[PDB]
C-alpha cells in the first residue's frame, strides 16, 4: 500500500535529507550498489555503457531496486556474473513526506483537513537531472549487446525518458581508450582495488619512484 510514483515524480521541494532535524527516516529499499565482478581490474573491462537520465525528476529507491534486480539478473543469466561490473550511480538521499488521511466513510468526524499538514517520512528518492548517469556497466567489448539489452530492461522500471550511451572512456576511468593505452605503455598507471592510481610530474620524486617503480627505465 504505497502511493503511485506520479505523486513524487518531480523535484518540487528542496532536498530533505536524513539529518539531525529529520532523524526518523525509513530505510531505503536499495542496499547493493555494485554488482557482478566488482573486484575486477581496470584493464579487464575496457567498455563502459551508461543509462543516462533525460528528465529532471526523482527516482524512488523502490525503482532503483527493481531496475537493479532486472539488469543484474539478465546479465548474470546470459553472460554469467564475472563478465561485468554494474555500479548504480545515484543514492536515495531525499526523503518523501506523506500527510496521511483516513480513507473510510465517516472520516469526516476526525479528519482535521489541511491543518498541520506537514507530513511524516514515507520513502526515499534519488534526485537526478538532465544528463545524469543512473547506471554504469563496465565489461568487455564482446559482451556489449547483453549489457545494452539489460540496461534496456532496467529502463522500463524508471519513470520518464532515459538514454543508453556508449562511453568513449576506458571502463570507469575518466580517460579515453587511446590515452589509457598510452599510459599503460608508459609507467603512469598502477593497479588498485578495482580502480588505478596515476603518476604525475608533481609531488615527491622519491615517492614517485617507490610507486610506479618500472618507469624511469
Amino acid at each position: 500500500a504505497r502511493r503511485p510514483a506520479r505523486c513524487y515524480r518531480y523535484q518540487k521541494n528542496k532536498p530533505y535529507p536524513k539529518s539531525r532535524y529529520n532523524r526518523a527516516v525509513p530505510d531505503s529499499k536499495i542496499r547493493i550498489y555494485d554488482l557482478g565482478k566488482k573486484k575486477a581490474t581496470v584493464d579487464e573491462f575496457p567498455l563502459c555503457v551508461h543509462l543516462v537520465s533525460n528528465e529532471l525528476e526523482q527516482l524512488s529507491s523502490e525503482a532503483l531496486e527493481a531496475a537493479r534486480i532486472c539488469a543484474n539478473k539478465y546479465m548474470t543469466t546470459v553472460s554469467g556474473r564475472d563478465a561485468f561490473h554494474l555500479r548504480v550511480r545515484v543514492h536515495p538521499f531525499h526523503v518523501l513526506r506523506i500527510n496521511k488521511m483516513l480513507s473510510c466513510a465517516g472520516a469526516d468526524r476526525l479528519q482535521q483537513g489541511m491543518r498541520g499538514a506537514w507530513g511524516k517520512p514515507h520513502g526515499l528518492a534519488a534526485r537526478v537531472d538532465i544528463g545524469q548517469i543512473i547506471f554504469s556497466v563496465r565489461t568487455k567489448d564482446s559482451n556489449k549487446d547483453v549489457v545494452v539489452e539489460g540496461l534496456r530492461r532496467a529502463r522500463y522500471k524508471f519513470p520518464g525518458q532515459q538514454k543508453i550511451i556508449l562511453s568513449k572512456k576506458w571502463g570507469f576511468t575518466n580517460l579515453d581508450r587511446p590515452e589509457y593505452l598510452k599510459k599503460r605503455e608508459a609507467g603512469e598507471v598502477k593497479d588498485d582495488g578495482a580502480f588505478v592510481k596515476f603518476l604525475s610530474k608533481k609531488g615527491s620524486l622519491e615517492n614517485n619512484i617507490r610507486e610506479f617503480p618500472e618507469y624511469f627505465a
Partner: protein
Amino acid sequence: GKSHGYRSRTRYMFQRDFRKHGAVHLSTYLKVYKVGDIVDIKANGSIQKGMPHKFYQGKTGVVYNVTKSSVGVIINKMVGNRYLEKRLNLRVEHIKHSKCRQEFLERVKANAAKRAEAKAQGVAVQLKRQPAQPRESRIVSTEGNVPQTLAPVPYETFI
C-alpha cells in the same frame, strides 16, 4: 512564535573571514576620524561592544561626533515614505574610511593643480569628467595580420 531579536539573521555576516579570526591589527586603532569624515560600517564580529545593528551593515555615513573609542555616524534610513536621520555610536573596529571620498579629495587637489597651471599657460583646461566617448576612425593594417578564421563547428557527443 516568531523571533526578531537584535542579532537575528546575522549568522553569516557577523562571521569572521576564513583564516582571519583573532585579534584586530593596530592599523584599525591608528586611524584618525574627524567630524565630517565619510565612513563605511562593517561590524567586526569579535568585538561585541559598540556593535552596529544588522541594518547598518554596509551603510555609509558621515561622522558627527568623536568620543574616546567611538565615533558618531549619521545614516539616512528609509522608514515608510521618507528618510529618517539615524545616529549611531560605533567603536572604530566596525568603521573604515570611504575610499571613494579619498579619491574625491585627491581629484579636488588635482583639479586645483590643473586650474593653477591653466591660469598661467594653456587656458580652457576643461575640468569636468566626461563619459566614455565613441571611438574615432582608424586604419587597421593587414600586413602581417592576414585575416583567417573558419565557420561554426559540428556537434560532438563528448561523453
